[PDB]
Amino acid sequence: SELDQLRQEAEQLKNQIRDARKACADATLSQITNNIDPVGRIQMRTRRTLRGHLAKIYAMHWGTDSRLLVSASQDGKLIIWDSYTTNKVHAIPLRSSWVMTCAYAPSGNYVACGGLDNICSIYNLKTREGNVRVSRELAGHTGYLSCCRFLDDNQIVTSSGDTTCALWDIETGQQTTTFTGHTGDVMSLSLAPDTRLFVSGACDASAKLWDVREGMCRQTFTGHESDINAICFFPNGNAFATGSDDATCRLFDLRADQELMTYSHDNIICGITSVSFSKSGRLLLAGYDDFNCNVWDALKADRAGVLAGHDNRVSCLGVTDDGMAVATGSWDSFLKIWN
Amino acid sequence: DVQLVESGGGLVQPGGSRKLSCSASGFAFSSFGMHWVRQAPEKGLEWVAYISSGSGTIYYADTVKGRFTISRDDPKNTLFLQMTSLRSEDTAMYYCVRSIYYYGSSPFDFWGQGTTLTVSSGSDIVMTQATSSVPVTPGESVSISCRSSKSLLHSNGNTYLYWFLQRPGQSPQLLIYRMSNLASGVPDRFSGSGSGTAFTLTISRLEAEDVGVYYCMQHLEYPLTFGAGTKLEL
Amino acid sequence: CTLSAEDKAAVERSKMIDRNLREDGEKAAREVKLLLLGAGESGKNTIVKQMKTGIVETHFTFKDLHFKMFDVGAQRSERKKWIHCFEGVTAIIFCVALSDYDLVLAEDEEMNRMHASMKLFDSICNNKWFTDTSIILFLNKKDLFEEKIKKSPLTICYPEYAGSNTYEEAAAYIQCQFEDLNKRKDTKEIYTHFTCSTDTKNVQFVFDAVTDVIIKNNLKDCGLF
Amino acid sequence: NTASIAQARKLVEQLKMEANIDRIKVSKAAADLMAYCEAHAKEDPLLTPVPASENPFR
Amino acid sequence: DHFLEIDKKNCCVFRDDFIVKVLPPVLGLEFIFGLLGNGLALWIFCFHLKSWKSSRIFLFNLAVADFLLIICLPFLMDNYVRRWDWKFGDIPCRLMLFMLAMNRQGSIIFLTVVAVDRYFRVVHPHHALNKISNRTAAIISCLLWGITIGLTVHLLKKKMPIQNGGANLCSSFSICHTFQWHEAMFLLEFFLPLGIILFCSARIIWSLRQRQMDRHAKIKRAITFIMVVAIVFVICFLPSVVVRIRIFWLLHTSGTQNCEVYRSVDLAFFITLSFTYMNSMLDPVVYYFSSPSFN
Ligand SMILES: Cc1c(C(=O)N[C@H](C)COc2ccccc2)cnc2c(-c3ccc(C(C)C)cc3)cnn12
Ligand SMILES: CC(C)CCC[C@@H](C)[C@H]1CC[C@H]2[C@@H]3CC=C4C[C@@H](O)CC[C@]4(C)[C@H]3CC[C@]12C
Ligand SMILES: CC(C)CCC[C@@H](C)[C@H]1CC[C@H]2[C@@H]3CC=C4C[C@@H](O)CC[C@]4(C)[C@H]3CC[C@]12C
Ligand SMILES: *[C@@H]1O[C@H](CO)[C@@H](O)[C@H](O)[C@H]1NC(C)=O
């Protein structure tokens, strides 16, 4: 039987990978960060409250100018906010109201959204007609589209619930690259700062690091006991943090190919919806199902602070590119800006 | 394409009443605030009236206030300028101007072709251009300077300075909308700068396509005031 | 105050957007959101045609009441990752064919379509997001179940069934088996209706169940529920 | 059911290419992350709050 | 003997010892429990509720009317301990009487509004009245308050007290043989809202049992408390009305001569008028603290 021999070879390769990870570990992150000063208590106050959504907010994305937001709620509305003045720049009605994710282009010219319609819709913000119109609808995913991230004005990587990540060309609307290898539904997506690699967390309790231009999984990261819902690179792009339903956040290294630290507390039993890093990467902000966001010392696994003030589950998180503020979206149809 | 077509102009006896229409096509007319800007045969842009989206805000120039009426009908995409008691200083070519206002928007971006109407026989921000007509060699850089009585820099960091180029026999177009921001469809050889009350507009590698009258307009507060107009010759 | 002309115009645009969002929300609040569920293509299609690729939107109006019916078929993914999107639906319309009690699912060995429907109903009814959501259970194809129960007894599906091979008794037993999966009988109620291939009163039954749900929502809004 | 051999070959190929990866010691990993955190600690507004004059969300 | 001209009208009043022996303790209990209940309920409405709807607005206005009717009870107690003697003056008695009558009528009006609101919740579920905004509820409530003010401020233009035999009389309910708007308002504010409330409650019960919705336990609780509020309204406002009707019959038959027969009906009227304030004391328990969604 060749299948039994190949299963044995796969088990041997997994054992070799585990042994390499174990022998490559000498001193944990906690053991070397215990000699550095803690961040103390991080106190953040709600500076702005963005009202206007009438259903649960499922996703957000900050602009690269650190002032413009896009939010997605089950109203079927993509609202673009001026976070400084709490002004609604745009209100984009969606054909399908079952939106799970929204992205904002780095140039600021486009927004994306998607969800249970299995379609990533690109919207042109800066048109000559003065309205926001659908640039195109990206079809080809057979499951719900759970995350999308713009690479540039013409490239976008979409996470989906068909256990598949996809890279798209927005001029042609075609499937440029398909990323396969996940067993469970891919729920999260994060692009590297150089936008050469990206990580995706799925429902198989596994995180995979992909190469955009090669279309293959380079490394696979395990350690979670439940479905990974959130993922985010470290600001230098050498590490990333995941958030899952087991009330634990893990930090993984790309170069060490191993988990570095777990961010869990005994009083936390609910799942984690969103994971974001501060500008320096010292603070790890995680949104939970128990209605508040917990700030974590990313180097010491210490609860630096709590962002409480949402009456429902905090579904989405985002730190501005200048690190000035963090915005929390929640199922109570509200967005809050914290400093 | 975006198009604004004006109608209703003509020869009018003094004290008469005429109504101007501005048919809009190719853009979402309801979401745009709309301006009326007239230009007398002495070649000077003058703002007349403004109506916001939803007709919630209406402003008039002090010389037409209570005497002109601006209105819009969004179902048929038409802008109206109901004028009564027309006097000889109202003899101008009226432009219907398209402007939208949000963060990062580019108001005054599209101007209509204009309709010509002929009449037979203190606290405002003064906008000043020192040079009214200067000759320029094509292929060489030129600078057009503008000054304002009040500082156009606001507390929010925006300097509300607009640069318009009006080629001979053409409607004005927007080049720079907030003192530095290049407009859409205009070349990168146009650059705006300045601070406070002093302003400049640099045109490196000038071509015959840039020949016209250059106007500086403020949008810090109503009424919107234009410069006298710097004309480039040769 | 301390705003420029462009700032004031942007604020006015934001207020126009706020108003338009408010009429959109008021229009959406009067619509009835229905989540259409069932094991495979059993009775969803005939129900959809009687009322009127990811999620399918079905719109129909009955007695000046607009209905939004969502079909989550062909969404072969983990339900728990997207079933919370329908937490606020008015009711769940569950379609179960009555004639597939002897059929095999053809996906697993010794797998019964009726038991698959029963486990799907158990997962949906006892879901954490549908604690107070009423279920309009439809037992479809009662004519085929009429004509095929004589040839094939129901005991091949339920070994504990000891009743006679009559349509009424077996249908009552089937309905009892489906309602026994409800572990939250103190906070939700299950509406069971038997539909033929061409049944006209299904829309009226849905309207009555939705009206009961709307009465309950009105009472909890006024503090009586 | 002969198509599962191709999937098993793909899985063992993926495991083989994932195994042959140069890995740095986790102590070096901790060193680089601490160095990045300390090198950008002053320019982190959330970690070190800026005065109300420099806060756009005042 | 007891004869007294108030506004040049032939009539008579009484100062009974049983007033002193009954009214102060029952009004003390009514004030203490109604004050605690109404203040607590107002606290939850003001702070604990997140976003209250139109029905909660009507319930808040009912609580406000009940609280304002309660907080003028110590003055009634002070008038009652000294056997119908008012020692406060001209303007405070007019405020007390006007405020008592106005908040009684407003409490009744908002009970009727809550009953009709629940009628439209149950009997006409898809009606546009069940989705009115907070601004519409504000306008409707302001109009109802203005109606109550317009119907009640006739008490503020009356020269008061009455000072019969050196004893200041602070009462808007004097048995006098002249047709008055105040007595007609007293009878109307029972009989017409009684009919509206009974019709609404009966139709709500009939609809909840015709749709077989009464099988639910919480629907049983709602049906029970609808019956409770109807019964509380009846037992709190019927006795004073029937005693006032008996007074009307005595005035029609006997007139204002030999007032020794009016003493018993006057005493009974004031004892049964205490039940009106008992209604406002019991209103929080049967309206807000019994709501499952109420914190
Ligand atoms: C007598 C009377 C008075 C009155 O002014 N009594 C004085 C003490 C003066 O007492 C009297 C009597 C008769 C003759 C002389 C003096 C007031 N309201 C009413 C009503 C009423 C019946 C229905 C409604 C609703 C539509 C349901 C409202 C009111 C009926 N009778 N009535
Ligand atoms: C759901 C809400 C908005 C409906 C409100 C309509 C009903 C309940 C309101 C509107 C006008 C009100 C009436 C106005 C006038 C009077 C006369 C007064 O001496 C007794 C109460 C009574 C009879 C009020 C009862 C309640 C009332 C009928
Ligand atoms: C719109 C949202 C914020 C709710 C607003 C509350 C409104 C609807 C309610 C709550 C309290 C109410 C007030 C309570 C008391 C009085 C005194 C009375 O003599 C006149 C009416 C008036 C003034 C009511 C008007 C309506 C009112 C203001
Ligand atoms: C009051 O009584 C006097 C004396 O009998 C009589 O003249 C007068 O008409 C009466 N007035 C009324 C209103 O009953």
Side-chain angles (χ1 to χ4, degrees), chain A residues 15-38:
Chain A
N15 265 319
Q16 166 186 336
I17 287 154
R18 188 259 302 161
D19 187 76
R21 282 176 210 211
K22 184 251 290 181
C24 196
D26 44 355
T28 81
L29 180 60
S30 296
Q31 292 172 22
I32 316 161
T33 53
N34 77 319
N35 200 2
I36 79 174
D37 289 329

PDB file of all heavy atoms in Angstrom, chain A residues 15-38:
ATOM      1  N   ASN A  15       7.390  14.797  12.428  1.00  0.00           N
ATOM      2  CA  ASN A  15       8.247  14.580  13.590  1.00  0.00           C
ATOM      3  C   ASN A  15       9.588  15.284  13.428  1.00  0.00           C
ATOM      4  O   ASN A  15      10.121  15.839  14.393  1.00  0.00           O
ATOM      5  CB  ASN A  15       8.451  13.084  13.823  1.00  0.00           C
ATOM      6  CG  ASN A  15       7.474  12.515  14.830  1.00  0.00           C
ATOM      7  OD1 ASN A  15       7.188  13.136  15.852  1.00  0.00           O
ATOM      8  ND2 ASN A  15       6.961  11.324  14.548  1.00  0.00           N
ATOM      9  N   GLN A  16      10.150  15.265  12.217  1.00  0.00           N
ATOM     10  CA  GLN A  16      11.406  15.968  11.967  1.00  0.00           C
ATOM     11  C   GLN A  16      11.238  17.476  12.125  1.00  0.00           C
ATOM     12  O   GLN A  16      12.109  18.145  12.690  1.00  0.00           O
ATOM     13  CB  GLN A  16      11.930  15.625  10.572  1.00  0.00           C
ATOM     14  CG  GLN A  16      13.034  16.546  10.078  1.00  0.00           C
ATOM     15  CD  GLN A  16      13.434  16.265   8.645  1.00  0.00           C
ATOM     16  OE1 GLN A  16      13.247  15.158   8.142  1.00  0.00           O
ATOM     17  NE2 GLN A  16      13.990  17.269   7.978  1.00  0.00           N
ATOM     18  N   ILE A  17      10.123  18.023  11.635  1.00  0.00           N
ATOM     19  CA  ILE A  17       9.855  19.452  11.793  1.00  0.00           C
ATOM     20  C   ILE A  17       9.717  19.809  13.269  1.00  0.00           C
ATOM     21  O   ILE A  17      10.266  20.816  13.737  1.00  0.00           O
ATOM     22  CB  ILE A  17       8.601  19.847  10.990  1.00  0.00           C
ATOM     23  CG1 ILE A  17       8.903  19.849   9.492  1.00  0.00           C
ATOM     24  CG2 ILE A  17       8.087  21.209  11.421  1.00  0.00           C
ATOM     25  CD1 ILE A  17       7.689  19.606   8.623  1.00  0.00           C
ATOM     26  N   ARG A  18       8.989  18.983  14.025  1.00  0.00           N
ATOM     27  CA  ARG A  18       8.828  19.220  15.456  1.00  0.00           C
ATOM     28  C   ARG A  18      10.163  19.135  16.187  1.00  0.00           C
ATOM     29  O   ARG A  18      10.440  19.942  17.081  1.00  0.00           O
ATOM     30  CB  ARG A  18       7.823  18.222  16.032  1.00  0.00           C
ATOM     31  CG  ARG A  18       7.410  18.476  17.476  1.00  0.00           C
ATOM     32  CD  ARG A  18       8.156  17.556  18.431  1.00  0.00           C
ATOM     33  NE  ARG A  18       7.922  16.152  18.117  1.00  0.00           N
ATOM     34  CZ  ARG A  18       8.691  15.154  18.529  1.00  0.00           C
ATOM     35  NH1 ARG A  18       9.760  15.368  19.277  1.00  0.00           N
ATOM     36  NH2 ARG A  18       8.380  13.909  18.180  1.00  0.00           N
ATOM     37  N   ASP A  19      11.003  18.164  15.821  1.00  0.00           N
ATOM     38  CA  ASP A  19      12.309  18.028  16.455  1.00  0.00           C
ATOM     39  C   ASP A  19      13.213  19.210  16.125  1.00  0.00           C
ATOM     40  O   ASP A  19      13.970  19.674  16.984  1.00  0.00           O
ATOM     41  CB  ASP A  19      12.966  16.716  16.030  1.00  0.00           C
ATOM     42  CG  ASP A  19      14.247  16.435  16.790  1.00  0.00           C
ATOM     43  OD1 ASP A  19      14.166  16.036  17.971  1.00  0.00           O
ATOM     44  OD2 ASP A  19      15.337  16.613  16.205  1.00  0.00           O
ATOM     45  N   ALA A  20      13.157  19.700  14.885  1.00  0.00           N
ATOM     46  CA  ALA A  20      13.932  20.882  14.519  1.00  0.00           C
ATOM     47  C   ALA A  20      13.464  22.106  15.293  1.00  0.00           C
ATOM     48  O   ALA A  20      14.287  22.906  15.754  1.00  0.00           O
ATOM     49  CB  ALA A  20      13.839  21.128  13.015  1.00  0.00           C
ATOM     50  N   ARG A  21      12.148  22.264  15.453  1.00  0.00           N
ATOM     51  CA  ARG A  21      11.625  23.374  16.244  1.00  0.00           C
ATOM     52  C   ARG A  21      12.050  23.265  17.704  1.00  0.00           C
ATOM     53  O   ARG A  21      12.390  24.273  18.334  1.00  0.00           O
ATOM     54  CB  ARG A  21      10.102  23.425  16.137  1.00  0.00           C
ATOM     55  CG  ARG A  21       9.584  24.030  14.848  1.00  0.00           C
ATOM     56  CD  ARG A  21       8.069  23.953  14.776  1.00  0.00           C
ATOM     57  NE  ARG A  21       7.593  23.841  13.403  1.00  0.00           N
ATOM     58  CZ  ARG A  21       6.439  24.326  12.965  1.00  0.00           C
ATOM     59  NH1 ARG A  21       5.609  24.969  13.770  1.00  0.00           N
ATOM     60  NH2 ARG A  21       6.111  24.164  11.688  1.00  0.00           N
ATOM     61  N   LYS A  22      12.029  22.050  18.260  1.00  0.00           N
ATOM     62  CA  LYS A  22      12.402  21.866  19.659  1.00  0.00           C
ATOM     63  C   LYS A  22      13.889  22.121  19.879  1.00  0.00           C
ATOM     64  O   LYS A  22      14.268  22.828  20.819  1.00  0.00           O
ATOM     65  CB  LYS A  22      12.025  20.458  20.118  1.00  0.00           C
ATOM     66  CG  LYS A  22      12.281  20.192  21.594  1.00  0.00           C
ATOM     67  CD  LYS A  22      13.450  19.240  21.791  1.00  0.00           C
ATOM     68  CE  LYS A  22      13.096  17.830  21.349  1.00  0.00           C
ATOM     69  NZ  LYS A  22      14.228  16.884  21.552  1.00  0.00           N
ATOM     70  N   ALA A  23      14.744  21.553  19.026  1.00  0.00           N
ATOM     71  CA  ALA A  23      16.181  21.753  19.162  1.00  0.00           C
ATOM     72  C   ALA A  23      16.601  23.170  18.807  1.00  0.00           C
ATOM     73  O   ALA A  23      17.678  23.607  19.227  1.00  0.00           O
ATOM     74  CB  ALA A  23      16.937  20.750  18.290  1.00  0.00           C
ATOM     75  N   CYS A  24      15.783  23.892  18.047  1.00  0.00           N
ATOM     76  CA  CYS A  24      16.056  25.281  17.720  1.00  0.00           C
ATOM     77  C   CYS A  24      15.646  26.236  18.834  1.00  0.00           C
ATOM     78  O   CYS A  24      15.983  27.423  18.770  1.00  0.00           O
ATOM     79  CB  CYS A  24      15.339  25.655  16.419  1.00  0.00           C
ATOM     80  SG  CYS A  24      15.909  27.173  15.645  1.00  0.00           S
ATOM     81  N   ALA A  25      14.940  25.749  19.850  1.00  0.00           N
ATOM     82  CA  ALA A  25      14.502  26.568  20.972  1.00  0.00           C
ATOM     83  C   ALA A  25      15.468  26.386  22.136  1.00  0.00           C
ATOM     84  O   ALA A  25      15.664  25.265  22.616  1.00  0.00           O
ATOM     85  CB  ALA A  25      13.080  26.202  21.393  1.00  0.00           C
ATOM     86  N   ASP A  26      16.065  27.488  22.587  1.00  0.00           N
ATOM     87  CA  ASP A  26      16.983  27.474  23.718  1.00  0.00           C
ATOM     88  C   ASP A  26      16.485  28.315  24.882  1.00  0.00           C
ATOM     89  O   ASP A  26      16.465  27.836  26.022  1.00  0.00           O
ATOM     90  CB  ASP A  26      18.373  27.961  23.274  1.00  0.00           C
ATOM     91  CG  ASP A  26      18.303  29.179  22.377  1.00  0.00           C
ATOM     92  OD1 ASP A  26      17.179  29.597  22.028  1.00  0.00           O
ATOM     93  OD2 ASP A  26      19.370  29.718  22.018  1.00  0.00           O
ATOM     94  N   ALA A  27      16.079  29.557  24.628  1.00  0.00           N
ATOM     95  CA  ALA A  27      15.570  30.440  25.667  1.00  0.00           C
ATOM     96  C   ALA A  27      14.319  31.133  25.153  1.00  0.00           C
ATOM     97  O   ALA A  27      14.366  31.820  24.128  1.00  0.00           O
ATOM     98  CB  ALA A  27      16.618  31.478  26.082  1.00  0.00           C
ATOM     99  N   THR A  28      13.214  30.969  25.875  1.00  0.00           N
ATOM    100  CA  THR A  28      11.936  31.500  25.430  1.00  0.00           C
ATOM    101  C   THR A  28      11.930  33.027  25.493  1.00  0.00           C
ATOM    102  O   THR A  28      12.818  33.663  26.067  1.00  0.00           O
ATOM    103  CB  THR A  28      10.797  30.932  26.277  1.00  0.00           C
ATOM    104  OG1 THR A  28      10.707  31.658  27.507  1.00  0.00           O
ATOM    105  CG2 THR A  28      11.048  29.466  26.584  1.00  0.00           C
ATOM    106  N   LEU A  29      10.903  33.614  24.875  1.00  0.00           N
ATOM    107  CA  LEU A  29      10.753  35.066  24.866  1.00  0.00           C
ATOM    108  C   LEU A  29      10.539  35.616  26.272  1.00  0.00           C
ATOM    109  O   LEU A  29      11.064  36.686  26.603  1.00  0.00           O
ATOM    110  CB  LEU A  29       9.594  35.456  23.946  1.00  0.00           C
ATOM    111  CG  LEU A  29       9.198  36.923  23.748  1.00  0.00           C
ATOM    112  CD1 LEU A  29      10.335  37.743  23.180  1.00  0.00           C
ATOM    113  CD2 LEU A  29       7.976  37.023  22.854  1.00  0.00           C
ATOM    114  N   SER A  30       9.781  34.901  27.107  1.00  0.00           N
ATOM    115  CA  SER A  30       9.561  35.340  28.483  1.00  0.00           C
ATOM    116  C   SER A  30      10.864  35.373  29.271  1.00  0.00           C
ATOM    117  O   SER A  30      11.111  36.311  30.039  1.00  0.00           O
ATOM    118  CB  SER A  30       8.551  34.422  29.171  1.00  0.00           C
ATOM    119  OG  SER A  30       7.279  34.494  28.553  1.00  0.00           O
ATOM    120  N   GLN A  31      11.710  34.355  29.093  1.00  0.00           N
ATOM    121  CA  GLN A  31      12.948  34.253  29.856  1.00  0.00           C
ATOM    122  C   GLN A  31      13.919  35.389  29.564  1.00  0.00           C
ATOM    123  O   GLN A  31      14.777  35.680  30.402  1.00  0.00           O
ATOM    124  CB  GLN A  31      13.636  32.917  29.571  1.00  0.00           C
ATOM    125  CG  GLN A  31      12.893  31.701  30.091  1.00  0.00           C
ATOM    126  CD  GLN A  31      13.510  30.402  29.615  1.00  0.00           C
ATOM    127  OE1 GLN A  31      14.685  30.357  29.252  1.00  0.00           O
ATOM    128  NE2 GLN A  31      12.721  29.334  29.620  1.00  0.00           N
ATOM    129  N   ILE A  32      13.816  36.024  28.400  1.00  0.00           N
ATOM    130  CA  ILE A  32      14.758  37.071  28.026  1.00  0.00           C
ATOM    131  C   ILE A  32      14.100  38.437  28.180  1.00  0.00           C
ATOM    132  O   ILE A  32      14.785  39.456  28.323  1.00  0.00           O
ATOM    133  CB  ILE A  32      15.284  36.848  26.598  1.00  0.00           C
ATOM    134  CG1 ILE A  32      15.639  35.376  26.406  1.00  0.00           C
ATOM    135  CG2 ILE A  32      16.532  37.669  26.357  1.00  0.00           C
ATOM    136  CD1 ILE A  32      15.730  34.951  24.966  1.00  0.00           C
ATOM    137  N   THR A  33      12.770  38.474  28.168  1.00  0.00           N
ATOM    138  CA  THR A  33      12.058  39.725  28.393  1.00  0.00           C
ATOM    139  C   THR A  33      11.710  39.969  29.854  1.00  0.00           C
ATOM    140  O   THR A  33      11.194  41.045  30.176  1.00  0.00           O
ATOM    141  CB  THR A  33      10.773  39.771  27.563  1.00  0.00           C
ATOM    142  OG1 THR A  33       9.994  38.598  27.822  1.00  0.00           O
ATOM    143  CG2 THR A  33      11.092  39.862  26.084  1.00  0.00           C
ATOM    144  N   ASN A  34      11.958  39.007  30.745  1.00  0.00           N
ATOM    145  CA  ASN A  34      11.704  39.253  32.160  1.00  0.00           C
ATOM    146  C   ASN A  34      12.653  40.283  32.761  1.00  0.00           C
ATOM    147  O   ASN A  34      12.384  40.777  33.860  1.00  0.00           O
ATOM    148  CB  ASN A  34      11.801  37.949  32.953  1.00  0.00           C
ATOM    149  CG  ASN A  34      13.234  37.518  33.195  1.00  0.00           C
ATOM    150  OD1 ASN A  34      14.084  37.615  32.312  1.00  0.00           O
ATOM    151  ND2 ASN A  34      13.510  37.040  34.403  1.00  0.00           N
ATOM    152  N   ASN A  35      13.743  40.617  32.074  1.00  0.00           N
ATOM    153  CA  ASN A  35      14.740  41.548  32.582  1.00  0.00           C
ATOM    154  C   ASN A  35      14.519  42.968  32.063  1.00  0.00           C
ATOM    155  O   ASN A  35      15.330  43.856  32.341  1.00  0.00           O
ATOM    156  CB  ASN A  35      16.143  41.050  32.213  1.00  0.00           C
ATOM    157  CG  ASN A  35      17.239  41.664  33.073  1.00  0.00           C
ATOM    158  OD1 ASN A  35      16.972  42.441  33.989  1.00  0.00           O
ATOM    159  ND2 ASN A  35      18.484  41.310  32.777  1.00  0.00           N
ATOM    160  N   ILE A  36      13.441  43.205  31.322  1.00  0.00           N
ATOM    161  CA  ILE A  36      13.145  44.525  30.787  1.00  0.00           C
ATOM    162  C   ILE A  36      11.963  45.112  31.552  1.00  0.00           C
ATOM    163  O   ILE A  36      11.181  44.400  32.181  1.00  0.00           O
ATOM    164  CB  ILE A  36      12.869  44.491  29.269  1.00  0.00           C
ATOM    165  CG1 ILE A  36      11.451  43.998  28.987  1.00  0.00           C
ATOM    166  CG2 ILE A  36      13.889  43.615  28.560  1.00  0.00           C
ATOM    167  CD1 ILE A  36      11.057  44.072  27.534  1.00  0.00           C
ATOM    168  N   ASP A  37      11.848  46.436  31.502  1.00  0.00           N
ATOM    169  CA  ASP A  37      10.800  47.116  32.245  1.00  0.00           C
ATOM    170  C   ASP A  37       9.439  46.860  31.602  1.00  0.00           C
ATOM    171  O   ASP A  37       9.325  46.843  30.372  1.00  0.00           O
ATOM    172  CB  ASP A  37      11.070  48.619  32.306  1.00  0.00           C
ATOM    173  CG  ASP A  37      12.239  48.965  33.205  1.00  0.00           C
ATOM    174  OD1 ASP A  37      12.474  48.228  34.185  1.00  0.00           O
ATOM    175  OD2 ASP A  37      12.922  49.972  32.930  1.00  0.00           O
ATOM    176  N   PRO A  38       8.394  46.657  32.399  1.00  0.00           N
ATOM    177  CA  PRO A  38       7.049  46.518  31.835  1.00  0.00           C
ATOM    178  C   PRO A  38       6.511  47.861  31.370  1.00  0.00           C
ATOM    179  O   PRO A  38       7.035  48.928  31.695  1.00  0.00           O
ATOM    180  CB  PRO A  38       6.232  45.959  33.001  1.00  0.00           C
ATOM    181  CG  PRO A  38       6.941  46.448  34.213  1.00  0.00           C
ATOM    182  CD  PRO A  38       8.403  46.487  33.862  1.00  0.00           C
TER     183      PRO A  38
END
